[PDB]
RNA sequence: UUUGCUCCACACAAUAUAGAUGGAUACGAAUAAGGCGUCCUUGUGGCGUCGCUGAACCAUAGCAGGCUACGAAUUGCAAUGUCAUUUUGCGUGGGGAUAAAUCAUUUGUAUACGACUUAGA
RNA sequence: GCAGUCAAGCGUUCAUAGCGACAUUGCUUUUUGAUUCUUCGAUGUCGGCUCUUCCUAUCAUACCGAAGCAGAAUUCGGUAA
RNA sequence: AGAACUGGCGAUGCGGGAUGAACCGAACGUAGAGUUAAGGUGCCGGAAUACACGCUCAUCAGACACCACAAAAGGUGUUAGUUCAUCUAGACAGCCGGACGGUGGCCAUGGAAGUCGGAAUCCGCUAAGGAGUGUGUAACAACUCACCGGCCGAAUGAACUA
RNA sequence: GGCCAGCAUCAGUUUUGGUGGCAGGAUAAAUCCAUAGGAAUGUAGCUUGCCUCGGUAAGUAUUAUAGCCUGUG
């Protein structure tokens, strides 16, 4: 008969191979990848390319990321760094709006006052054309 | 403990299409259709085929999984009630006083009253649910036959009947009078 | 950092609202709470009802007009919960609680002004998914609020009067974004993007 | 505490009748080299006619983990004194470190049985070499091929106290 | 005997602050779910896309902000370095409006006295 | 004073429908005690009459459950003051 | 009520214990700065709606020892756990089928093939079926299971601790 | 000329931070490298009903068209 409309969610789910991003830690902000699972609350990870050591960490301190790649259960630092370069994970990550807005915030914070004045100047020119055009 | 993934699987025959969103279910079929609300339970759904849904609950902890199979048997019975339907065959019991049962249209919709319950003069009536049909037998005329699609409505109506005509201040071990159910079945099987 | 803060109160917890409000209003911030009839509260319905039927029991014995004034409406239940957290027996609490104007539903003046939300009192984030909660409208009406089904006739008219404005503004801003994005490829934007705009 | 694992070798004082008194080794889980000695002289004094004064601590060392970056299924045999009676248990734990197993043991005991550190004696802690000698299901369910589960109900910690939009729990 | 009342219009003066010197910047609803854009056999729809904090968005130069289509120093190294907005008084000119209560007398549908209830050009 | 657990047995056969010793864990301050902390430069001290309120460990009244309840009449219990 | 060692109140303020002569901390000239004790950090209330591992949802929940109270016996409510075994030589559960012949094996005989009752108890057939687990006709019969087979393809029991 | 403020320079007490060097432990363990064996929550490959290029079925198979563990250095 007619198709059955159904949808609950498509979560980003912890698994052997998922990328994560740390929000609170000694190396927060830097990417990482999951190796395997300990229990419901904590896992072990290693981001070798970003300089993350091989840790065991809970899941409150991290944020699961949509992008994912493949690796076997119980992997090691070298294998992880290998597949990390294989899957173009860093470039898949820098291409999304999340990393764009992170770098946006971090460049807005790094503005000298001359640049904060430049932006006040520049925004007056674009909105002038936009008000000339929406009229 | 807390589990990980406890999932049941609901089959679906042909002629049934289940529109499910925000746990507000709609289930159609030849007999008719039936809605349902499950906002008060935390459970997922995945339409892996047009022939079965996979219902699942995560960790939960022995009080969510207890409701998982409950949900599954609600949906299974609703699909059953829109594919085939339900009937309840009730009977009467007495020795001396009959139980004159009738359907009367009062100021609103149908009511189903009984007279002469142990010689009472309270002409007691009952409201009929909106999704229910009703009839009598012909092999014998000391019965009644409820029918419909929602079992929780039909059986609740039958229970409403047999709860109001209960004997009181008398030994029920002796005065085995009233009405009762005798068969739950379908109107296509 | 605003002069007045209009706190919507849907899906919020009572005693966890009142502990941020009781501090932010003692620190000077005018806080007007609104849609207090849709508040939420922990525990079950019968439980949070008996915790009030064991409060209607506590009246003065010799003249019950001197005693605890059992207010039945949500805007006064919440005000009682805040008055407990505030030292209202001084000219500091007396001056704080005039910085607080509470209503049921949204009136016209706060219809057009932007509402906010307090995340450290939301049922959504605080209460475990699966527990039982109680709706303060249901409670107040079970203990004798006469003015619920009127608020339902006012609030839906508020909602239809606001949603059409939202659609009107949608169909004004969708093309503002076009006028910007269709003109944001000059140096004026290629230079702002290098600064983070 | 922030537990560490020690290695304590003790020795009854040299008496001239026997100036080579056979040594005794204990592998202890504790916070530091002050209470390691105390737990040694506690667990020994109930096994040998020797006190703190009638003996000397030959060696104290710290055992670090051989492969702390490797998940293990530990099995812990233990005894614990209730309010009314003493019992023995066997609890299985999944963690990377011999000492983090003890960390999550004392809490899992102080919660489920309300036994404090003074009413607990760690008897045996052992790795499991192969994944069929396990017996507990809360451990076994994490041994499935291609394990995957979500975190359905996310909550974001608010830095500021007010917000201007409903938050959403989707991850 | 518009001495007096009442407003709006500005000319000051006086008194007061439970405390502003960029903007209280508007859908609703659910959270084991939603928004936004498009298409449409307009459906509890297909596709894409977003959060992961408002750390945003809007305005933002100009004698504490000007002459015109230049001047801004010497408060001599800091001293709120004055602007908010109610309440009230005064004179001027451009207006509009012309009454009720109480005491006393009296009634008794009422009453300890007050009070209440009525009547009186 | 009030209540509960065992159940040795009574209960036409039928431990517990009701009852229930041998023992035992409790509750109360409406009994009688015990003690002497307050008051000896005085708290006016028995009962009755009048009057208001509250408590439940409910005699009656309401809906009920349970029996060695056929009906009637009764006993036990519960929500309940 | 009455004694022993020590400490304290009396003679003693201060911070804490909501308030308390005795408890915890600590003993005092008037002031300033710093750090702390005992106790606490949602608000009153000055201070983390801090972090991590778990438990509990209670129609009188529970929350600063002294201190302002609470038991015996119980609960498949839930958690974690000890002991014992069943078992892919198909248990545990459910549905389907068989449960028959020697023989009414004997006495109570007003009538019991098993059965209102009582002394008594073995074979054939077998996958397997009792001289019988109940319902019942004055009797017989007809029903059910202990006993085994078919779908079943996993584990299920029993007792106990806190 | 005296009083009240600001700044610098120093003194006493104290607080909060950034950073460098050195020593130790199993002269950290670990990661990484070399190397000998072992196993599966069985990777390829090969058997296997069909087919999404062996995708399912479940045998085989110890690194191979992924990897892991254990030990030693």
Short mmCIF file of C-alpha atoms in Angstrom, two decimals, chain C residues 1 27 34 40 66 74 77 83 101 105 118 128 133-134 143 145-146 165 173-174 177 181 186 191:
data_model
loop_
_atom_site.label_atom_id
_atom_site.label_comp_id
_atom_site.label_asym_id
_atom_site.label_seq_id
_atom_site.Cartn_x
_atom_site.Cartn_y
_atom_site.Cartn_z
CA UNK C 1 21.95 43.73 30.70
CA UNK C 27 20.51 42.89 42.41
CA UNK C 34 4.70 35.98 32.12
CA UNK C 40 5.84 23.07 35.51
CA UNK C 66 -5.19 36.92 60.12
CA UNK C 74 -0.21 30.53 39.72
CA UNK C 77 1.90 30.66 44.04
CA UNK C 83 8.61 35.75 48.99
CA UNK C 101 5.35 42.25 37.98
CA UNK C 105 -0.75 34.82 30.01
CA UNK C 118 16.18 30.56 31.93
CA UNK C 128 15.20 13.11 33.72
CA UNK C 133 5.61 16.43 36.43
CA UNK C 134 2.54 18.54 37.16
CA UNK C 143 -7.74 24.05 44.13
CA UNK C 145 -8.91 29.04 40.13
CA UNK C 146 -11.92 30.35 38.24
CA UNK C 165 3.19 38.85 12.08
CA UNK C 173 13.57 39.10 5.72
CA UNK C 174 13.93 36.24 3.22
CA UNK C 177 19.06 37.98 3.00
CA UNK C 181 24.05 37.57 -0.28
CA UNK C 186 32.64 42.69 -3.56
CA UNK C 191 37.60 41.96 3.38
#
